[PDB]
Amino acid sequence: VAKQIFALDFEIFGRVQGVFFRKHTSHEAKRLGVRGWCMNTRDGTVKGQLEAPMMNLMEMKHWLENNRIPNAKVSKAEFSQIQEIEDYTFTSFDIKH
């Protein structure tokens, strides 16, 4: 189960645009061994998806909700349920536009 890959969706609210949030997110995902993507939304949020083994996944989720991201002020982080997936669908972690 420790080499199983799990997946979740996320959306982060607060002062999360105009503060390099996406670059920070990409850096932290990649250094935690988490794949996925994120984007700035028309709602003034950052949304995306993660894929990783459970341990790595939950570390990334912690970082997204712990509110110690430089220059960002996170008012809340929303997540989907966790699902197991057969294999990674993403090669890495990408910022979308």
Q: Which residues of 11-42 are buried (b: 16+ CB within 10 A; e: fewer)?
A: bbbbebbebebbebbbebbeebebbbbbebee
Look up the domain containing 54 and give its range: 1-97
Cited resolution, angstroms = 1.5
How many domains are there within the chain? 1
Specify whether 67 is catalytic: no
State the method.
Answer: X-ray
Specify whether 15 is catalytic: no
Cα(first)–Cα(last) distance of the chain, in Å?
A: 34
Q: Which is the catalytic residue, given 15, 40, 56, 68?
A: 40
Task: Give the CATH number for residue 40.
Answer: 3.30.70.100
Q: Which is the catalytic residue, given 22, 35, 42, 56?
A: 22
Rounded to 5°, the CA angle 88-92-93 comes to 115
